[PDB]
Scaffold this active site. Structure first.
Site, mmCIF file in Angstrom:
data_model
loop_
_atom_site.group_PDB
_atom_site.id
_atom_site.type_symbol
_atom_site.label_atom_id
_atom_site.label_comp_id
_atom_site.label_asym_id
_atom_site.label_seq_id
_atom_site.Cartn_x
_atom_site.Cartn_y
_atom_site.Cartn_z
ATOM 1 N N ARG A 83 0.840 -1.089 0.007
ATOM 2 C CA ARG A 83 0.065 0.043 0.104
ATOM 3 C C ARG A 83 0.829 1.327 0.237
ATOM 4 O O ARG A 83 1.587 1.281 0.743
ATOM 5 C CB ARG A 83 -0.814 -0.050 1.343
ATOM 6 C CG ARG A 83 -1.678 1.416 1.230
ATOM 7 C CD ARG A 83 -2.722 1.258 2.314
ATOM 8 N NE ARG A 83 -3.468 2.370 2.796
ATOM 9 C CZ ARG A 83 -4.533 2.355 3.478
ATOM 10 N NH1 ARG A 83 -5.040 1.279 3.957
ATOM 11 N NH2 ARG A 83 -4.988 3.603 3.715
ATOM 12 N N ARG A 92 -6.188 2.574 -2.947
ATOM 13 C CA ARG A 92 -5.192 1.537 -1.871
ATOM 14 C C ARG A 92 -5.454 0.002 -2.411
ATOM 15 O O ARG A 92 -6.489 -0.347 -2.591
ATOM 16 C CB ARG A 92 -5.351 1.777 -0.583
ATOM 17 C CG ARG A 92 -6.685 1.173 0.028
ATOM 18 C CD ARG A 92 -7.825 2.219 -0.140
ATOM 19 N NE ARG A 92 -7.724 3.735 -0.122
ATOM 20 C CZ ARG A 92 -7.639 4.310 1.195
ATOM 21 N NH1 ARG A 92 -8.196 3.620 2.193
ATOM 22 N NH2 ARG A 92 -7.026 5.316 1.389
ATOM 23 N N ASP A 95 -6.730 -2.269 2.585
ATOM 24 C CA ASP A 95 -7.118 -1.462 3.750
ATOM 25 C C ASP A 95 -7.648 -2.501 4.673
ATOM 26 O O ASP A 95 -8.722 -3.167 4.386
ATOM 27 C CB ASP A 95 -8.184 -0.318 3.645
ATOM 28 C CG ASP A 95 -8.549 0.553 4.738
ATOM 29 O OD1 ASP A 95 -7.408 0.779 5.551
ATOM 30 O OD2 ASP A 95 -9.768 0.978 5.001
ATOM 31 N N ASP A 97 -9.305 -2.799 8.494
ATOM 32 C CA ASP A 97 -9.975 -1.814 9.785
ATOM 33 C C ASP A 97 -10.289 -2.559 10.851
ATOM 34 O O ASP A 97 -10.970 -3.521 10.453
ATOM 35 C CB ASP A 97 -10.907 -0.648 8.997
ATOM 36 C CG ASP A 97 -10.294 0.397 8.178
ATOM 37 O OD1 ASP A 97 -8.832 0.460 8.110
ATOM 38 O OD2 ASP A 97 -11.243 0.913 7.519
HETATM 39 N N1 LIG Z 1 -10.404 0.995 13.979
HETATM 40 C C1 LIG Z 1 -9.133 1.189 13.423
HETATM 41 N N2 LIG Z 1 -8.639 0.268 12.508
HETATM 42 C C2 LIG Z 1 -7.669 0.729 11.749
HETATM 43 N N3 LIG Z 1 -6.691 1.714 12.056
HETATM 44 C C3 LIG Z 1 -7.228 2.432 12.889
HETATM 45 C C4 LIG Z 1 -8.331 2.428 13.431
HETATM 46 N N4 LIG Z 1 -8.836 3.394 14.521
HETATM 47 C C5 LIG Z 1 -7.586 4.244 14.098
HETATM 48 N N5 LIG Z 1 -6.791 3.824 13.248
HETATM 49 C C6 LIG Z 1 -5.518 4.529 12.729
HETATM 50 O O1 LIG Z 1 -5.707 4.955 11.399
HETATM 51 C C7 LIG Z 1 -4.306 5.430 11.003
HETATM 52 C C8 LIG Z 1 -4.640 5.566 9.372
HETATM 53 O O2 LIG Z 1 -5.313 4.350 8.695
HETATM 54 P P1 LIG Z 1 -5.876 4.514 7.429
HETATM 55 O O3 LIG Z 1 -6.080 3.151 6.930
HETATM 56 O O4 LIG Z 1 -4.891 5.247 6.227
HETATM 57 C C9 LIG Z 1 -7.683 5.268 7.508
HETATM 58 P P2 LIG Z 1 -8.636 4.481 6.315
HETATM 59 O O5 LIG Z 1 -9.021 3.176 6.686
HETATM 60 O O6 LIG Z 1 -8.375 4.705 4.969
HETATM 61 O O7 LIG Z 1 -9.991 5.422 6.549
HETATM 62 P P3 LIG Z 1 -11.329 5.054 7.415
HETATM 63 O O8 LIG Z 1 -10.873 5.073 8.952
HETATM 64 O O9 LIG Z 1 -12.201 6.220 7.110
HETATM 65 O O10 LIG Z 1 -11.553 3.930 7.000
HETATM 66 C C10 LIG Z 1 -3.723 4.016 11.176
HETATM 67 O O11 LIG Z 1 -2.589 4.177 11.292
HETATM 68 C C11 LIG Z 1 -4.216 3.563 12.805
HETATM 69 O O12 LIG Z 1 -3.191 4.213 13.497
HETATM 70 N N1 LIG Z 2 -16.785 2.005 -0.410
HETATM 71 C C1 LIG Z 2 -15.769 2.415 0.238
HETATM 72 N N2 LIG Z 2 -15.686 4.114 0.438
HETATM 73 C C2 LIG Z 2 -14.686 4.129 1.218
HETATM 74 N N3 LIG Z 2 -14.212 5.068 1.760
HETATM 75 C C3 LIG Z 2 -13.169 5.156 2.645
HETATM 76 S S1 LIG Z 2 -12.144 6.378 3.342
HETATM 77 C C4 LIG Z 2 -12.289 7.780 1.759
HETATM 78 C C5 LIG Z 2 -11.623 7.157 0.593
HETATM 79 C C6 LIG Z 2 -10.182 6.979 0.226
HETATM 80 C C7 LIG Z 2 -9.908 6.799 -0.641
HETATM 81 C C8 LIG Z 2 -10.309 6.405 -1.857
HETATM 82 F F1 LIG Z 2 -9.848 5.995 -2.890
HETATM 83 C C9 LIG Z 2 -11.693 6.573 -1.636
HETATM 84 C C10 LIG Z 2 -12.358 7.127 -0.432
HETATM 85 N N4 LIG Z 2 -13.012 3.887 2.488
HETATM 86 C C11 LIG Z 2 -13.831 3.198 1.916
HETATM 87 C C12 LIG Z 2 -13.952 1.685 1.849
HETATM 88 O O1 LIG Z 2 -13.419 0.775 2.055
HETATM 89 N N5 LIG Z 2 -14.957 1.585 0.767
HETATM 90 CL CL LIG Z 3 -2.056 1.668 -3.003
HETATM 91 MG MG LIG Z 4 -7.544 1.876 7.181
HETATM 92 MG MG LIG Z 5 -10.866 2.220 6.025
#
Ligand SMILES: Nc1ncnc2c1ncn2[C@@H]1O[C@H](COP(=O)(O)CP(=O)(O)OP(=O)(O)O)[C@@H](O)[C@H]1O
Ligand SMILES: Nc1nc2nc(SCc3ccc(F)cc3)[nH]c2c(=O)[nH]1
Ligand SMILES: [Cl-]
Ligand SMILES: [Mg+2]
Ligand SMILES: [Mg+2]
Ligand code: NA
Ligand code: NA
Length: 157
Positions: A83, A92, A95, A97
């Site tokens: 990533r 990405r 991801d 989460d």
């Molecule tokens: N429940 C959770 N799961 C995963 N990462 C988490 C989290 N709560 C906070 N974070 C933090 O979020 C930081 C950034 O992660 P990213 O994956 O870039 C956010 P994202 O998943 O793209 O957005 P989203 O949270 O809106 O889905 C991680 O380094 C982590 O420390």
């Molecule tokens: N459907 C859907 N929408 C989501 N929005 C997020 S965070 C904003 C974001 C970040 C990068 C990107 F390219 C598009 C949207 N994560 C999502 C996911 O996993 N699925």
């Molecule tokens: Cl990527």
């Molecule tokens: Mg994440």
């Molecule tokens: Mg996410």
């Protein structure tokens, strides 16, 4: 042993292969055992500009890791899948989460569980409901099946 739920997403590369590889990698960590996997959904991006569509799913794990140990495994898996992290958000490869960790509520700078946006995300709640319909989300005190809502932007893949 704690029952936890992860949300996975991919919107660049071979999305399906990357999600499958991610699950295998997650399962290979000691202290994480994948016990169920939802169907895969193709979903419209939310919360940003127009972007390529995601494949999203949810995974159930039985874990003996602390929630921060778990988070390290999640982020390492993203790194295995190459990533990219630029100045601005974009598509990405993977991801991972943390959605739910037992009935626990955690609020740390680097970790918020339940995930702060899950209760208003169809791309989470629809696959989550396939594997966790009777699981309680501890902030709302509602079961997943009582949070899920219909959303035509989330389709079985
Ligand atoms: N429940 C959770 N799961 C995963 N990462 C988490 C989290 N709560 C906070 N974070 C933090 O979020 C930081 C950034 O992660 P990213 O994956 O870039 C956010 P994202 O998943 O793209 O957005 P989203 O949270 O809106 O889905 C991680 O380094 C982590 O420390
Ligand atoms: N459907 C859907 N929408 C989501 N929005 C997020 S965070 C904003 C974001 C970040 C990068 C990107 F390219 C598009 C949207 N994560 C999502 C996911 O996993 N699925
Ligand atoms: Cl990527
Ligand atoms: Mg994440
Ligand atoms: Mg996410
Ligand atoms: Na394991
Ligand atoms: Na916080």
């Amino acid at each position: 042993m704690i029952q936890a739920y992860l949300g996975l997403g991919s919107n660049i590369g071979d999305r399906e292969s990357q999600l499958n590889d991610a699950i295998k990698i997650l399962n290979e960590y000691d202290g994480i055992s994948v016990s169920n996997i939802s169907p895969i959904y193709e979903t419209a991006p939310v919360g940003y500009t127009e972007q390529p569509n995601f494949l999203n799913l949810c995974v159930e794990i039985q874990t003996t890791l602390t929630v921060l140990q778990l988070l390290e495994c999640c982020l390492k898996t993203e790194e295995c899948l190459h990533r990219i992290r630029k100045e601005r958000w974009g598509p990405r490869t993977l991801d991972v989460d943390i959605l739910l960790y037992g009935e626990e509520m955690i609020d740390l700078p680097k970790l918020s569980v339940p995930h702060p946006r899950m209760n208003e995300r169809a791309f989470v709640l629809i696959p989550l409901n396939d594997i966790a319909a009777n699981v309680v989300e501890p902030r709302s005190k509602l079961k997943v099946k009582d949070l899920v809502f219909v959303d035509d932007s989330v389709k079985r893949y």
